[PDB]
Amino acid sequence: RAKVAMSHFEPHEYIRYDLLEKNIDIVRKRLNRPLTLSEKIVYGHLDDPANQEIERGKTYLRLRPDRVAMQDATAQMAMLQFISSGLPKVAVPSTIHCDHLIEAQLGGEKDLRRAKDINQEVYNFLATAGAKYGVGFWRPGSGIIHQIILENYAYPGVLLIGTDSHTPNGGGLGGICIGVGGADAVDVMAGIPWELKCPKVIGVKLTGSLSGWTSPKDVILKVAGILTVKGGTGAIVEYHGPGVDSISCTGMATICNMGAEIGATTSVFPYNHRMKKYLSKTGRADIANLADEFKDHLVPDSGCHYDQLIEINLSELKPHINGPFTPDLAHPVAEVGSVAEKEGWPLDIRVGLIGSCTNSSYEDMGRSAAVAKQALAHGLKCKSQFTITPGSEQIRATIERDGYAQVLRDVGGIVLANACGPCIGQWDRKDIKKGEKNTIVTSYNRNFTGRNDANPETHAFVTSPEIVTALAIAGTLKFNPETDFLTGKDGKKFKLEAPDADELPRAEFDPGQDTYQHPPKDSSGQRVDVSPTSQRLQLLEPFDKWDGKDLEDLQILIKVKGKCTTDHISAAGPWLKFRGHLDNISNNLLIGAINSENRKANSVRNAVTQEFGPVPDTARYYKQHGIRWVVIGDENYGEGSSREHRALEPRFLGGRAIITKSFARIHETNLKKQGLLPLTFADPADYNKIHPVDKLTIQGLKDFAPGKPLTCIIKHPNGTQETILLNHTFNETQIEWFRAGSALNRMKELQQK
Numbered sequence: 001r002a003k004v005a006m007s008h009f010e011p012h013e014y015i016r017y018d019l020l021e022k023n024i025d026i027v028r029k030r031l032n033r034p035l036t037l038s039e040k041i042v043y044g045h046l047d048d049p050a051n052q053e054i055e056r057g058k059t060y061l062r063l064r065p066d067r068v069a070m071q072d073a074t075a076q077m078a079m080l081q082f083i084s085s086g087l088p089k090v091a092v093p094s095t096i097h098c099d100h101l102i103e104a105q106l107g108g109e110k111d112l113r114r115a116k117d118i119n120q121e122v123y124n125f126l127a128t129a130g131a132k133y134g135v136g137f138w139r140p141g142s143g144i145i146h147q148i149i150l151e152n153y154a155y156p157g158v159l160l161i162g163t164d165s166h167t168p169n170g171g172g173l174g175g176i177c178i179g180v181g182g183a184d185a186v187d188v189m190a191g192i193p194w195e196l197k198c199p200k201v202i203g204v205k206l207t208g209s210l211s212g213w214t215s216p217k218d219v220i221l222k223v224a225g226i227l228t229v230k231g232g233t234g235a236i237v238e239y240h241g242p243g244v245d246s247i248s249c250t251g252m253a254t255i256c257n258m259g260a261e262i263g264a265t266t267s268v269f270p271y272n273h274r275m276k277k278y279l280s281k282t283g284r285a286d287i288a289n290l291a292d293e294f295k296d297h298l299v300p301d302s303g304c305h306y307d308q309l310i311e312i313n314l315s316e317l318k319p320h321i322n323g324p325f326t327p328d329l330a331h332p333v334a335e336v337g338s339v340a341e342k343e344g345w346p347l348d349i350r351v352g353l354i355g356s357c358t359n360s361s362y363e364d365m366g367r368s369a370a371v372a373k374q375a376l377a378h379g380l381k382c383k384s385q386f387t388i389t390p391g392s393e394q395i396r397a398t399i400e401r402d403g404y405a406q407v408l409r410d411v412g413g414i415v416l417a418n419a420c421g422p423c424i425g426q427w428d429r430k431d432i433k434k435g436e437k438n439t440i441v442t443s444y445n446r447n448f449t450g451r452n453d454a455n456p457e458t459h460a461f462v463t464s465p466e467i468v469t470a471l472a473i474a475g476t477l478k479f480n481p482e483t484d485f486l487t488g489k490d491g492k493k494f495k496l497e498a499p500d501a502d503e504l505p506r507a508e509f510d511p512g513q514d515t516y517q518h519p520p521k522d523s524s525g526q527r528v529d530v531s532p533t534s535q536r537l538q539l540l541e542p543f544d545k546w547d548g549k550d551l552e553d554l555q556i557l558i559k560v561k562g563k564c565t566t567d568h569i570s571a572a573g574p575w576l577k578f579r580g581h582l583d584n585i586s587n588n589l590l591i592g593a594i595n596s597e598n599r600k601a602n603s604v605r606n607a608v609t610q611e612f613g614p615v616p617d618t619a620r621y622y623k624q625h626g627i628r629w630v631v632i633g634d635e636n637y638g639e640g641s642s643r644e645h646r647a648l649e650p651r652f653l654g655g656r657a658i659i660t661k662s663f664a665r666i667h668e669t670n671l672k673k674q675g676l677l678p679l680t681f682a683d684p685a686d687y688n689k690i691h692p693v694d695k696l697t698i699q700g701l702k703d704f705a706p707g708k709p710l711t712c713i714i715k716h717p718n719g720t721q722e723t724i725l726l727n728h729t730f731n732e733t734q735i736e737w738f739r740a741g742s743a744l745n746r747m748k749e750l751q752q753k
């Protein structure tokens with residue numbers, strides 16, 4: 001066909017639209033129905049399109065992703081498991097991005113220099129394992145994983161997996177980009193088929209066009225309010241309609257990015273001329289030209305069926321701000337001042353934060369600078385503190401060159417390194433004490449309790465970068481940029497004009513400094529050294545194979561009440577230090593979950609000593625004494641970030657099963673991967689039949705089978721027993737992971753020894 005390379009760094013790896021077309025055509029001759037766009041890309045990547053069983057919401061697809069991307073808080077454990085597989089080189093284009101371990105304190109260059117010193121052991125490990133196994137390495141300072149991927153690696157029709165739940169960001173360039181745990185990335189780096197439950201497809205038809213203050217962020221702030229955080233589970237969101245041409249390519253990436261907050265498998269937009277324009281301005285006109293020749297396969301089929309349709313009229317959409325402790329609590333900016341007042345949310349904004357991968361594009365920085373130049377023209381600066389995170393080095397060099405960074409510095413902003421920083425709590429925040437109630441507004445995406453600064457009483461609202469800038473200047477939520485007046489230095493009242501800015505630089509992007517490190521694909525004789533006394537890195541010891549017996553008289557470690565995110569199960573912030581060390585990070589296990597017994601966090605009853613204490617310590621005491629335990633949870637257990645640490649930590653501390661009303665997708669997969677049993681109540685009311693003191697027996701593991709429920713005997717203290725049934729979503733592939741002790745153990749069994 002064409003020999004067009006997948007990126008500038010892999011001149012030999014060609015895009016295979018011929019393969020994609022061939023597979024789409026085998027599959028549509030079988031289904032004889034129109035295919036949505038996500039169906040074309042996903043089924044076009046099937047390992048076996050002729051025989052694969054295809055039913056939305058029901059079958060597991062065996063897929064062949066084109067490339068793997070990892071960020072440094074999840075890459076360490078993905079690479080420690082790849083190192084245990086014993087395989088010599090990764091089988092597909094793979095990258096590591098060092099963006100999660102740079103703490104915001106002093107701003108830019110200073111914070112990067114400090115991070116490089118503090119994290120030297122880890123950056124060393126990743127660069128060395130990268131050179132040895134043939135993984136490309138983007139150095140600290142290079143940028144946030146998803147911005148580097150949009151700028152260099154994402155293209156129409158790619159199937160990309162990344163160890164991060166905002167990998168869907170890449171849907172803004174017509175690709176299917178899916179968040180996974182490190183063990184799924186090991187499957188693909190090892191060359192074995194990746195499995196994904198066939199998704200449902202929610203269509204969102206966009207009509208009209210954006211105007212004035214309304215920006216691409218408002219479309220997904222509105223969709224999250226409609227669908228709620230559990231509304232997109234098991235589905236891909238596919239944007240279509242005449243209003244799509246109205247959104248810039250980075251705007252589409254913003255909307256696809258935050259679809260992670262409704263639990264969606266990923267989101268995607270159809271190839272159109274805005275993507276073509278972005279590919280040409282990022283050095284990839286040859287890929288835009290090839291995609292023009294395969295355009296029919298990069299847009300949905302006429303009359304394709306969506307399982308749910310939502311219509312949004314862009315012309316009527318007005319600015320939104322969401323939170324404070326969930327991303328689906330949506331409010332127009334116009335009314336948040338009044339709702340805050342009513343609910344007792346602090347009206348004064350201590351810090352306004354723009355950027356992160358969700359909103360750090362050139363157009364986002366241009367629009368925020370456009371609001372900031374007006375305030376400056378009246379002698380004002382920010383009343384709130386104000387920080388700016390550029391998404392990559394190229395965006396930092398280009399907004400610097402085109403003068404937007406200086407406007408943002410002149411209004412009182414501090415430019416932070418090109419890293420997650422405050423978005424995952426890597427922020428040395430000193431202005432409030434812990435427990436001090438206060439309000440910050442961000443252009444980020446998640447706004448859950450204690451995530452930006454480990455303070456549970458910080459009320460974080462997410463909105464667009466131009467609204468964070470307008471509200472940082474005002475310093476209060478009781479300010480609506482569309483209606484209200486500010487007073488200049490000079491005494492005159494003035495109103496902020498809606499920001500207008502270029503979506504891409506008129507000149508080319510300035511690439512900034514050299515930050516990519518290609519693997520020697522020659523040499524590769526590196527020794528990865530993990531010191532046996534390291535506190536940050538530890539080689540894995542394999543988990544135990546299943547004993548062949550049912551699980552009797554299991555102790556409940558904790559019955560969790562309400563929302564239990566992966567930040568409740570395995571907190572980030574300070575714990576990021578231990579992402580490569582399983583025993584040390586297991587000291588945060590479930591310390592944020594609320595115990596139904598006393599409604600406290602990190603205070604559970606030890607069944608032996610009858611002292612209430614920390615959950616980590618109690619799980620280690622049960623493990624030390626041979627007591628196998630269980631977690632009982634509520635709805636959407638495991639919501640949020642993809643960290644497989646939330647599944648590895650309970651396995652390590654002696655857990656056996658997690659029984660809930662429902663699971664978020666990535667956590668449920670991660671639990672199966674590590675040899676635990678994620679089970680759901682066949683009747684959710686049965687959650688109320690189980691009390692912290694009850695012991696449980698799970699029976700029927702001997703004839704464990706796809707579609708057959710497991711029986712659970714609840715043993716009450718008084719001698720009463722109640723039998724209930726538990727469903728699971730294991731297929732046969734996954735039951736083998738459980739029997740072997742973990743998926744990695746099963747893979748090492750298939751290597752003939």
Ligand code: SF4
Pocket residue numbers: 099144145146164166356357358419420421423424445
């Ligand atoms: S923590 Fe924030 S900036 Fe970093 S990859 Fe995730 S969403 Fe993006």
